[PDB]
Every structure is written in C-alpha cells, then in structure tokens.
C-alpha cells in the first residue's frame with residue numbers, strides 16, 4: 001500500500017526503505033523539460049515486500065532489473081510497480097534498476113508552488129517540495145524515507161550542472177559533459193538539488209566546526225539581478241552559530257545556488273536552491289537551519305511541517321540574538337502578525353495548511369514558550385538531543401512531546417502542549 005500520509009495518502013509505499021539512489025540523468029537541452037534517466041535504487045524493507053512501488057509522474061520506463069536479472073514491471077498513471085521474483089524481507093537489500101525517458105510533470109494544488117522539475121530561461125532545476133521529485137526520478141516520494149544520492153548529470157558541453165553532494169569528476173565525450181556528485185548523508189527526495197544550465201561554481205574557504213570540516217561552495221547562474229550576493233564570511237558565521245545550537249552540521253559542504261528566477265528558496269541538501277528574489281539574510285539562515293530540521297530530521301507525515309518550518313523559523317531568532325538583536329522583541333513581531341490571522345493546531349489537517357502562517361510562526365513561538373519555560377541551557381541541550389534522537393528516524397509531533405516529557409519534564413511537555421493543541425493562539429510567551 002501507500003505510506004498512508006494524512007495529507008497526501010497516495011504517495012510512497014508502506015514498509016519500503018530506499019537506502020541509496022544512483023542516478024544518471026541526461027538533459028539534452030537545459031530549459032526544456034524532456035530528459036532521460038538511468039537509476040539504480042539500493043532498497044531495504046521494514047516489512048516483507050513482494051513488489052517495489054515507486055512514484056513516477058511523467059517519464060516512461062523502458063526497462064527494469066532486480067539484482068541484475070530481468071524483472072516484471074508495469075507503469076500506472078502515477079506509479080511504477082516492479083514484481084520481484086521473491087519478496088524483499090527486513091534485513092535484505094536489493095538493486096532495482098529503471099531505465100526511463102520523457103517529460104516530467106509538475107504536481108498540482110493551486111500549495112505556494114507546483115513542485116517538480118522546473119524549466120525557465122535556459123535553466124532546468126528541481127524545486128520539488130513536497131512531492132515533485134517523482135517527476136524526474138522514480139522514487140519513494142515521502143520524507144519518511146530519506147536516502148543517499150549519487151548523481152551523474154550529462155549535459156551539452158556549453159552548459160554545466162550542479163547537484164547536492166560533493167563534486168567528484170567531470171568527463172567530456174562527443175560534445176557532452178558528465179558531472180558526478182555524491183550526497184553521502186541521507187536526505188528526503190525533495191531535498192535532492194539538481195540544476196543544469198549556465199552555472200559557475202565558486203569555492204570559498206573551508207569552515208572548521210571543532211573537529212568537523214565543512215567545505216564551502218556556491219553556484220552562480222547567469223543573469224542575476226544587481227545585488228544578488230552572498231556576503232563574505234557570512235555562511236561561516238551562520239554555520240558556527242547554528243551548529244553550536246543544534247549540534248554538528250549534518251553534511252560535508254554547504255552553499256547556495258543563486259538562480260535568476262522568481263521563486264521561493266528550498267533547502268536542497270548542502271546546496272540551497274536560492275532564487276534571487278528570495279536571497280535575504282533571514283532566508284539564507286532559514287534554509288541553512290533546514291539542513292538539520294527537514295533534511296537530517298525528516299517528517300513522518302506532511303501534517304507535521306511545523307517541525308521543519310517552525311524550527312527553521314526559530315533559528316532566525318537564534319541567529320538574530322547571536323548578532324546582538326533582541327530576541328524577545330522579534331518574537332513579539334511574530335505574535336503580532338499571527339494575532340491578526342487565524343490559528344490552528346500545529347498538526348495540519350489539509351494541504352493548504354502545511355505551509356501556512358501557523359506552520360512557521362506558531363511553530364517557532366511554540367519553541368519560544370518551551371525555551372522560556374526550561375531555560376536557555378536546558379533548551380539548547382534539548383535541541384542537541386532532539387537532533388540526535390531523530391537522526392535516522394522520522395519525527396512526529398507526538399514523538400516530540402514524548403521526548404520533551406522524557407528530557408525536560410512533564411511541566412515543559414504541558415507548556416508545549418498549549419501551543420501544539422488548541423485552535424486559538426495562546427498569549428505571547430514572555431519570561432516569567
């Protein structure tokens with residue numbers, strides 16, 4: 001069956017655990033949606049599976065293999081079903097290879113954006129939150145199932161490409177270039193960054209977070225507006241302040257891909273996809289904070305988006321305080337702007353809620369209430385334990401409350417409960 005998401009009940013396959021995607025993507029003309037793909041999924045399972053059912057929306061599979069053998073497959077309107085010769089059982093892993101080509105389709109909900117493979121002004125790129133990656137990649141398209149990625153992108157020699165993960169090698173043959181990237185920490189499918197077109201890679205000095213080293217590089221697309229810049233040394237300072245709050249930076253590199261398109265930013269892994277119209281300090285910090293909350297700590301259900309958006313938004317207040325600003329004052333402007341609009345319990349119930357004003361600011365103010373309740377020292381240690389508790393394990397609002405009660409006490413749990421439940425907006429959290 002499907003994963004059973006409360007918001008998108010048809011996505012994914014229950015019990016499937018994709019561990020790695022080995023993707024060879026070819027884009028013949030950047031800016032045009034057509035492409036071809038060759039992917040090998042290394043998959044495990046949490047329950048016996050007699051079939052592998054992946055989300056795919058657009059392209060047409062031409063061949064399928066399981067452990068190097070011919071395999072039975074069929075492609076429905078939104079899925080590819082692969083009948084295995086014997087069931088995949090917990091503890092086992094197999095290699096599913098799918099050959100496909102065609103045109104990715106954007107998923108609907110007119111959601112702030114139609115997610116999927118984007119094409120505009122000589123650029124083709126992924127902006128796939130929540131469920132757009134299935135457009136160009138046969139995948140278990142649900143954040144409950146993060147995975148590692150190895151991406152081989154083949155584009156004309158006149159163009160270039162950039163995907164999440166460390167840049168390894170580039171080869172050229174018959175007017176085509178192939179670039180290889182290795183995303184070596186598991187992230188959700190929508191966090192797979194992929195951009196092809198006129199792109200320039202720009203390295204920066206390595207950042208050192210204690211004993212961890214974080215490589216630095218940004219992507220600069222052509223035709224950026226005036227003032228589309230990343231200030232020198234800013235990313236290093238953000239990494240320092242954030243990792244001191246949340247724990248080690250989960251990836252090996254970080255930067256932004258500045259695109260001359262008009263869209264909202266997306267926290268694609270280790271390489272934030274950043275349209276110029278969203279390039280702001282708070283957004284650059286927000287997207288970086290998501291590398292912990294969203295990419296490393298992933299959602300068990302799309303209803304709990306406030307665990308990603310509320311946490312990343314509160315990191316903007318943490319960064320503001322680090323830079324000498326009044327955090328309580330910032331929380332007051334959040335409350336004032338929420339006062340005017342409707343509120344809801346933090347568990348979303350329908351599609352239009354998962355990215356509304358309460359996912360961001362009521363979720364952030366929920367953490368403010370907890371922080372003022374327990375103290376900055378206890379709050380900081382909690383965020384560290386929260387990241388570690390939910391690394392390699394999808395997070396839920398219910399599981400968060402349990403961890404708060406376990407670590408911070410039942411009283412703190414009750415304080416968070418006030419903000420997690422109830423339709424009306426509680427009073428502005430203030431220091432007692």
Ligand SMILES: NC(=[NH2+])NCCC[C@H](N)C(=O)O
Pocket residue numbers: 112129264265266267286287290355356
């Ligand atoms: N406007 C939106 N709700 N966009 C979807 C979220 C995009 C991205 N995850 C962010 O941090 O903003």
Ligand code: NA
Pocket residue numbers: 017018019145146147186
């Ligand atoms: Na996985």
Ligand SMILES: [Zn+2]
Pocket residue numbers: 286290308309312
């Ligand atoms: Zn966000």
